[PDB]
Design goal:
Layout lengths: L6 H21 L9 H15 L3 E2 L12 E4 L2 E3 L14 E10 L2 E10 L5 H20 L6 H14 L3 E2 L5 E3 L6 E5 L16 E4 L2 E3 L5 E3 L6 E3 L5 E3 L2 E5 L3 E4 L11 E3 L11
Antiparallel strand pairs: 1-4, 2-4, 3-12, 4-5, 6-10, 7-8, 9-14, 10-13, 11-12, 14-15, 15-16
Helix pairs in contact: 1-2, 3-4
The structure holds sodium ion.
Sodium ion binds next to β2, β3, β4 and β13.
PDB class: hydrolase
Keywords: hydrolase(alpha-aminoacylpeptide), site-directed mutant, hydrolase
Assembly: monomeric
């Protein structure tokens, strides 16, 4: 029930994913102490609309009140931009952007560390991206989604962090949320063999502390039950013939848009 994208479909997500990454590349310079998250949200939206002539898939979604999600520190996800929420020195902040372009979505997010980073702030951010890269490196047809969550978890835990279990990455495309569910941890429940053309997200949410979270009153914002810091990075990718292509790659990523596996690349018949 997982949709297989069409070359044309794919070019579209590429455009979409590219637009999503640019929002993140653009926001960067405004992410600094004293900046309110409402303003960041503003910039983002203005950007999506006016310059990219696209639309935030988040804006008003099922009621969601802001253009992008800006989760600070113990906020795991769905953090709601608010003009009263100023960024502080040492904060860690996720900005989650989802853009719709020509009917296709581009979904990604990254962590920003404001001012002087904190030991743990820095480490979790690093570790979290790594868990994302790590999964990225394994994306390839024939692999089971389950081996990936497994890998993420293993890594994360070995690094002394936790993986939130309640929220996942997912198929995406014409629809914001599509199958499959992309768990960032092990699950006997998980059974998804990757096929080329599949487009989905990977967006491991990592707690410096315990994995338990708490959903807030507002119905959106998620936080760590123990109040430890939480970090997330996400990429939207397409499964290729031999690996994956990262649709939301940013200048600052240090992973290649295109990941291929030797064993899968085209080769002579006897090679
Ligand atoms: Na956080």
């Amino acid at each position: 029930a997982i949709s297989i994208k069409t070359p044309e479909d794919i070019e579209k997500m590429r455009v979409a994913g590219r637009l999503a990454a640019e929002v993140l590349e653009m926001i960067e310079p405004y992410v600094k102490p004293g900046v309110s998250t409402g303003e960041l949200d503003r910039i983002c939206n203005d950007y999506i609309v006016n310059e990219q002539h696209a639309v935030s898939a988040c804006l008003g979604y099922h009621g969601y009140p802001k253009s992008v999600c800006i989760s600070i520190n113990e906020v795991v996800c769905h953090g709601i931009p608010d003009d009263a929420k100023l960024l502080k020195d040492g904060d860690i902040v996720n900005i989650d952007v989802t853009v719709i372009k020509d009917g296709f979505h581009g979904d990604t997010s990254k962590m920003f560390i404001v001012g002087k980073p904190t030991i743990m702030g820095e480490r979790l951010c690093r570790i979290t991206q790594e868990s994302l890269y790590l999964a990225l490196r394994m994306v390839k047809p024939g692999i089971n989604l389950r081996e990936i969550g497994a890998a993420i978890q293993k890594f994360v835990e070995a690094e002394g962090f936790s993986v939130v279990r309640e929220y996942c990455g997912h198929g995406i495309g014409q629809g914001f949320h599509e199958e499959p569910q992309v768990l960032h941890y092990d699950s006997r429940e998980t059974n998804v063999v990757l096929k080329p053309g599949m487009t989905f997200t990977i967006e491991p949410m990592v707690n410096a502390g315990k994995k338990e979270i708490r959903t807030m009153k507002d119905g959106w914002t998620v936080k760590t039950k123990d109040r430890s810091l939480s970090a997330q990075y996400e990429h939207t990718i397409v499964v290729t013939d031999n690996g994956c292509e990262i649709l939301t790659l940013r200048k600052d990523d240090t992973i290649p848009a295109i990941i291929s596996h030797d064993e899968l690349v085209p080769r002579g018949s006897l090679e």
